[PDB]
Design a protein around this ligand. Structure first.
Ligand SMILES: [Cu+2]
Length: 106
């Protein structure tokens, strides 16, 4: 089981997730770390995950904006997380491009 870190706001101050795509296994953890240019959150899309399950997406999301410097949240993917793409975005910055994608694979 592995932990992968995704910066919220790149080191260069861009409104992106750094990195914006990652491939992981079920059971792995993605740590989302408040980095630059607040405020950010992490909302998984309800339809764009392999089960098209709003409940799966809710379970992986952190809807609350991260309001402290270097605040961390993490999503440990279920053991039974289905293979495929999981689209997520930052709500405030969605229209600025702050969108990401996790692929779950074996
Ligand atoms: Cu953001």
């Amino acid at each position: 089981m592995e932990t992968y870190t995704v910066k919220l706001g790149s080191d260069k101050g861009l409104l992106v997730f750094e990195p914006a795509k990652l491939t992981i296994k079920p059971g792995d953890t993605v740590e989302f770390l408040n980095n630059k240019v607040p405020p950010h959150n992490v909302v998984f899309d309800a339809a764009l995950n392999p089960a098209k399950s709003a409940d799966l997406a809710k379970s992986l999301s952190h809807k609350q904006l991260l309001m402290s410097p270097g605040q961390s949240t993490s999503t440990t993917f279920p053991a039974d997380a289905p293979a495929g793409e999981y689209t997520f975005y930052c709500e405030p910055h969605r229209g600025a491009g702050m969108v990401g994608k996790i692929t779950v694979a074996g």
